[PDB]
Amino acid sequence: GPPSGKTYMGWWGHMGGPKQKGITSYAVSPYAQKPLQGIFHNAVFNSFRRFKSQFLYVLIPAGIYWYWWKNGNEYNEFLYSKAGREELERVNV
Amino acid sequence: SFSSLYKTFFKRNAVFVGTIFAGAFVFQTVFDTAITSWYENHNKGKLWKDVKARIAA
Amino acid sequence: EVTDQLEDLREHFKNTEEGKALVHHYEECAERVKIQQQQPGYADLEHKEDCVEEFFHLQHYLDTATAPRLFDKLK
Amino acid sequence: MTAAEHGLHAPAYAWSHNGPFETFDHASIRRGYQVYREVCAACHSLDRVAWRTLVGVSHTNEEVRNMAEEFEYDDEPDEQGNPKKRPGKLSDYIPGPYPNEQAARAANQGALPPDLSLIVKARHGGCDYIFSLLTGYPDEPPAGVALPPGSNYNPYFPGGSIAMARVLFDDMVEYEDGTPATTSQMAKDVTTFLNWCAEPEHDERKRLGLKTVIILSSLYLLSIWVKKFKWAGIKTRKFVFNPPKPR
Amino acid sequence: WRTLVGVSHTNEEVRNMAEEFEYDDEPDEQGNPKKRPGKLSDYIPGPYPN
Amino acid sequence: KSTYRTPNFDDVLKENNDADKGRSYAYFMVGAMGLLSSAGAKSTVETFISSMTATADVLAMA
Amino acid sequence: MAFRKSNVYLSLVNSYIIDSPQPSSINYWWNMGSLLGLCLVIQIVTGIFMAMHYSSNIELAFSSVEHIMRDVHNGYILRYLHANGASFFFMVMFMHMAKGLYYGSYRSPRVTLWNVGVIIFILTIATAFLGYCCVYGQMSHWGATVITNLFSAIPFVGNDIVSWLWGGFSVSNPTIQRFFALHYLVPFIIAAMVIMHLMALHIHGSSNPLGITGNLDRIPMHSYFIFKDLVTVFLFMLILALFVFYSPNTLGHPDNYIPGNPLVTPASIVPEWYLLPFYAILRSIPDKLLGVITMFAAILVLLVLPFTDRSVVRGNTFKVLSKFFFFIFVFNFVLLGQIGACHVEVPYVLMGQIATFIYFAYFLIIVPVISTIENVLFYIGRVNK
Numbered sequence: 001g002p003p004s005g006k007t008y009m010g011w012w013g014h015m016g017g018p019k020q021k022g023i024t025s026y027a028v029s030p031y032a033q034k035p036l037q038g039i040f041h042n043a044v045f046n047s048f049r050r051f052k053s054q055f056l057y058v059l060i061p062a063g064i065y066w067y068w069w070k071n072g073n074e075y076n077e078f079l080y081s082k083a084g085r086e087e088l089e090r091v092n093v
Numbered sequence: 094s095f096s097s098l099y100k101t102f103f104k105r106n107a108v109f110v111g112t113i114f115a116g117a118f119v120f121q122t123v124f125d126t127a128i129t130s131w132y133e134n135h136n137k138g139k140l141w142k143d144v145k146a147r148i149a150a
Numbered sequence: 151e152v153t154d155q156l157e158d159l160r161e162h163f164k165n166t167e168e169g170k171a172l173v174h175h176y177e178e179c180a181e182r183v184k185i186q187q188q189q190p191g192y193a194d195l196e197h198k199e200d201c202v203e204e205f206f207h208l209q210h211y212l213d214t215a216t217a218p219r220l221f222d223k224l225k
Numbered sequence: 226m227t228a229a230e231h232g233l234h235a236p237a238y239a240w241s242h243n244g245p246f247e248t249f250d251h252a253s254i255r256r257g258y259q260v261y262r263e264v265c266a267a268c269h270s271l272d273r274v275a276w277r278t279l280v281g282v283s284h285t286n287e288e289v290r291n292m293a294e295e296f297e298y299d300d301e302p303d304e305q306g307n308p309k310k311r312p313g314k315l316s317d318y319i320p321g322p323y324p325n326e327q328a329a330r331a332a333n334q335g336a337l338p339p340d341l342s343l344i345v346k347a348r349h350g351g352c353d354y355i356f357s358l359l360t361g362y363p364d365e366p367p368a369g370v371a372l373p374p375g376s377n378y379n380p381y382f383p384g385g386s387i388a389m390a391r392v393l394f395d396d397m398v399e400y401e402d403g404t405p406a407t408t409s410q411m412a413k414d415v416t417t418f419l420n421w422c423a424e425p426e427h428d429e430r431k432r433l434g435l436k437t438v439i440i441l442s443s444l445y446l447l448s449i450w451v452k453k454f455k456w457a458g459i460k461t462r463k464f465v466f467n468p469p470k471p472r
Numbered sequence: 473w474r475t476l477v478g479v480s481h482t483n484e485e486v487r488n489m490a491e492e493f494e495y496d497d498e499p500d501e502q503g504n505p506k507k508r509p510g511k512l513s514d515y516i517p518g519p520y521p522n
Numbered sequence: 523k524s525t526y527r528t529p530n531f532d533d534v535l536k537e538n539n540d541a542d543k544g545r546s547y548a549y550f551m552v553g554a555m556g557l558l559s560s561a562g563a564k565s566t567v568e569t570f571i572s573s574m575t576a577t578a579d580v581l582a583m584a
Numbered sequence: 585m586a587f588r589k590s591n592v593y594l595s596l597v598n599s600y601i602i603d604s605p606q607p608s609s610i611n612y613w614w615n616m617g618s619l620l621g622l623c624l625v626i627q628i629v630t631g632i633f634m635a636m637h638y639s640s641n642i643e644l645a646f647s648s649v650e651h652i653m654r655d656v657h658n659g660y661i662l663r664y665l666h667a668n669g670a671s672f673f674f675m676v677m678f679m680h681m682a683k684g685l686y687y688g689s690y691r692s693p694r695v696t697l698w699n700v701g702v703i704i705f706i707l708t709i710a711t712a713f714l715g716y717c718c719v720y721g722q723m724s725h726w727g728a729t730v731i732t733n734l735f736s737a738i739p740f741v742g743n744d745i746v747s748w749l750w751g752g753f754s755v756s757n758p759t760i761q762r763f764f765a766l767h768y769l770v771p772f773i774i775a776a777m778v779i780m781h782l783m784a785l786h787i788h789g790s791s792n793p794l795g796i797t798g799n800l801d802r803i804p805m806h807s808y809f810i811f812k813d814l815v816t817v818f819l820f821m822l823i824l825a826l827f828v829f830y831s832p833n834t835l836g837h838p839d840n841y842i843p844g845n846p847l848v849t850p851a852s853i854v855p856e857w858y859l860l861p862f863y864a865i866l867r868s869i870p871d872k873l874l875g876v877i878t879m880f881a882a883i884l885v886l887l888v889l890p891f892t893d894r895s896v897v898r899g900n901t902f903k904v905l906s907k908f909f910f911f912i913f914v915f916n917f918v919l920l921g922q923i924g925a926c927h928v929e930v931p932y933v934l935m936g937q938i939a940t941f942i943y944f945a946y947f948l949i950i951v952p953v954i955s956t957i958e959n960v961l962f963y964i965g966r967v968n969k
């Protein structure tokens with residue numbers, strides 16, 4: 001077939017990565033292993049580690065936008081009451 | 094006694110998928126009738142057969 | 151021998167400490183709007199004050215007190 | 226906007242079908258059909274509900290067949306050409322009380338009563354809204370509001386003024402089983418019947434849902450196990466790097 | 473009737489020919505049905521009702 | 523560190539490396555998943571081609 | 585060699601779903617594409633088995649939908665699978681796009697993959713709108729006529745285009761037949777665009793949640809990532825079965841079951857919820873032609889995102905400031921979708937304007953500034969001169 005343009009990923013055997021030497025990789029068949037090894041230790045401790053490291057980046061913007069939405073919604077519910085109709089006309093024009 | 098179980102059930106794939114299909118047969122039927130029996134006994138007096146026997150008695 | 155259970159339950163919850171206060175606010179509305187309605191020049195005021203704020207507060211308290219008990223009272 | 230133009234939010238009642246495992250009360254469906262036939266049949270149409278869906282839910286087959294004889298239906302005409310009328314069978318639809326929509330507007334002061342076959346599904350709140358709308362008519366509107374002539378007050382209707390007068394009175398119907406007919410009892414029965422005629426798939430839907438989520442959650446747990454099994458050879462590989470000798 | 477103009481008759485002739493037939497108009501304020509003389513948008517009527 | 527000395531795996535391993543016991547356990551789990559998915563696939567296929575049968579109005583006017 | 589590598593169709597299926605070398609460290613966010621393919625096949629299958637009963641007139645559209653709901657066998661299942669799998673399709677698609685613009689897979693070797701994905705997003709918004717206007721309820725008809733009356737704001741050409749698009753003078757029988765033909769037709773363009781998405785991916789390989797090269801140690805697709813996809817497929821099927829069987833109407837508006845009457849307006853003409861942020865971007869600025877062109881700029885301003893990122897590290901995994909501002913952008917998108925559901929009222933018009941400004945400034949203003957700041961911070965923290 002037509003040999004098209006080279007990319008940054010080949011196939012198995014010539015993957016285009018750097019040449020490596022001296023990196024031994026030991027593994028064990030799963031039939032010799034126990035699956036669910038340490039699911040309660042890693043369910044209590046490692047999940048708390050990940051939640052501890054990555055919750056401020058999620059909860060500070062969620063806190064900002066939720067407080068903005070709650071303040072705006074309760075201001076609108078204040079304005080369309082009876083104690084804000086002069087403020088309703090003043091905000092209109 | 095695990096070698097005999099592995100030999101007669103999981104050695105060749107044909108008896109494996111045949112066991113899976115026969116278990117699917119009996120499992121689907123008894124699971125359907127068990128879950129409908131539980132669903133019709135959790136609502137006692139609210140079904141039409143109970144209302145029909147109530148207005149018939 | 152038997153009539154409505156919902157009206158009995160609303161009449162029962164119209165005598166609590168919160169319910170009497172909300173009812174009293176609603177009749178403060180009622181006679182204030184009646185006195186304001188009696189006055190001359192009511193054909194045009196630019197703001198004819200109704201009273202639905204207090205009726206909505208009373209009905210919301212009555213319905214959030216009435217919501218669990220009524221279907222236990224019914225058949 | 227203002228809560229008067231929003232409508233007062235209906236509360237959260239305790240229905241006999243609220244839940245993942247409960248169903249309709251079919252005796253309440255039968256009594257609610259009686260309340261629909263004696264009270265709401267004067268204005269409201271119910272057209273997407275055939276007579277045959279009522280069989281095996283609220284009445285028997287002989288009862289539905291003897292109920293469908295009371296109504297005339299348009300037949301295909303005879304050999305001479307002029308049209309004929311026939312008594313209704315089970316495959317026909319429940320007829321409306323008005324021949325068109327102009328007669329429905331003329332007999333109800335310009336306001337068209339909506340089709341009740343999808344009225345608890347096409348409303349915010351659902352059966353809580355229908356029940357609170359039926360019962361929450363005050364005897365006089367509060368001090369200050371002004372209604373047009375021919376329009377009654379109801380706080381749960383969004384706008385304040387509905388064109389439907391308070392119709393559910395005490396002992397308007399008498400149930401054939403002995404249940405005392407208050408207005409709250411008739412309101413609960415007729416909104417359970419409206420819930421049935423809006424979703425008849427309730428029992429079979431919750432039953433198939435129980436089957437499907439039991440099977441799928443067991444499949445989810447077994448698939449989590451087989452994923453950890455197939456990846457046990459990859460989660461626990463170890464790399465050792467001693468630095469190679471220079472050339 | 474609107475296909476008939478510009479082909480065999482003129483617009484005034486087809487509008488005068490369409491008045492001789494009655495058609496179903498939507499019912500009035502009371503609800504009982506009315507009849508109307510035909511306009512150019514309606515189809516040519518058949519002689520038998522069914 | 524030598525290249526013949528393996529690192530420890532004694533926490534991720536089991537004490538009895540029986541072939542038949544562990545293979546039977548793994549294949550019973552994958553077979554249970556296959557059984558539940560087989561019943562589910564059968565029921566959803568017969569749902570999809572039970573939709574294409576005679577609708578209830580046609581069965582009424584039969 | 586093997587028969588799965590020799591035969592021409594099986595070599596394609598092999599090279600795509602069997603031994604396609606995926607990077608070794610990808611987490612559960614990379615399964616959203618397999619989930620989107622499964623849910624697209626689900627939408628197409630239930631749509632065909634509903635279109636065998638759906639009649640697309642103006643007198644029979646809503647009546648035929650409620651005939652599917654009441655009389656055909658297991659038709660409630662089909663309609664709730666379609667109407668809820670569309671919502672789940674768009675939520676998994678939003679997760680796919682947010683993963684793509686968080687992990688930096690719009691970057692230098694897959695910009696054509698990102699552009700083809702944006703084309704897919706436009707096409708599925710279009711066919712989702714057409715499907716929502718097939719059913720002909722009260723939200724349906726008035727949402728159709730609201731955004732086509734929006735589309736008629738083009739100065740010289742607009743009324744002619746909108747009365748070509750309607751097939752008449754308002755939304756009626758030719759518009760509904762047109763919308764049924766187009767709602768069938770467009771997902772078979774999306775199937776070809778997804779084949780193009782897979783080709784433009786497969787020429788370069790997937791990214792990893794680190795930015796670094798996956799080319800060192802990769803993993804074949806068949807015995808590992810098919811089972812990760814199986815885990816997330818059964819979880820998605822469980823959540824979809826919950827939302828289909830136990831609360832089917834908790835997503836759609838409770839006004840689409842009123843039959844479409846072109847006289848009364850329901851006082852709240854919001855569309856289905858996945859079009860709510862773009863509807864808020866539309867209703868932000870008061871003029872109309874500028875509104876529709878800033879809605880189109882809000883859609884295809886994801887194309888400036890490859891050219892505007894000046895970070896030399898791929899992805900926001902090892903960054904802090906851009907993590908913070910990305911989650912600011914995501915919760916701003918959720919707030920924008922919340923604002924699109926309310927009426928144009930007293931804090932809502934200002935909140936919509938500020939929210940669409942933050943939306944348009946995350947791509948143009950905020951990200952090259954904070955990427956440049958992070959590059960300079962990395963350099964002056966690393967080197968000691």
Ligand SMILES: CCCCCCCCCCCCCCCC(=O)OC[C@H](COP(=O)([O-])OCC[N+](C)(C)C)OC(=O)CCCCCCCCCCCCCCC
Pocket residue numbers: 103104105106109110113549552553556557559560563
């Ligand atoms: C059609 C597209 C939509 C539908 C798309 C469906 C999903 C895609 C197709 C998946 C079909 C899976 C077929 C698996 C074929 C197979 O090789 O099964 C063997 C497995 C056990 O195989 P094993 O784990 O390698 O063990 C073998 C080793 N021994 C035990 C012999 C020592 O034994 C089992 O797996 C147990 C039987 C489970 C049966 C499969 C359930 C799903 C059936 C779906 C069939 C779909 C194909 C229909 C074609 C007309």
Ligand code: HEC
Pocket residue numbers: 260261264265267268269333336337338339344348355359382383387388389390392393415
């Ligand atoms: C006339 C003689 C009526 C009787 C008896 C009942 N209803 Fe009615 N209803 C009627 C009219 C003219 C209207 C239109 C008012 C409007 O502006 O909508 C209605 C309205 C309803 C509604 C709609 C409320 C909504 O929010 O849309 C419902 C749900 C309704 N009606 C139900 C109902 C029930 C359950 C009745 C008896 C058991 C009943 N109505 C009696 C006219 C008449």
Ligand code: HEM
Pocket residue numbers: 624627628630631632633634635638649652663666667670673708711712714715716717718719767768771772774836
């Ligand atoms: C891109 C994938 C698709 C999406 C996102 C999609 C989305 C939708 C949505 C949201 C609706 C409205 C449902 C409602 O009323 O709430 C709808 C309706 C419909 N869709 Fe689709 N659809 C898709 C593909 C298809 C295809 C390919 C077909 C045709 C084979 C189809 C057939 C229908 C039909 C017949 C309706 C009519 C109303 C109904 O019965 O639900 N859909 N679609």
Ligand code: HEM
Pocket residue numbers: 613614615616617618620621624677680681684687689690697698700701702704705774778781785789790791792
């Ligand atoms: C019909 C909808 C879509 C389908 C079926 C689809 C399918 C896929 C699949 C299967 C993958 C590979 C798995 C993965 O990497 O997550 C993928 C990757 C990707 N898709 Fe999509 N996609 C869709 C929509 C989109 C959209 C809307 C975008 C964004 C504009 C997009 C952008 C991407 C990107 C950037 C990647 C590469 C992710 C990476 O390698 O890091 N796709 N898509």
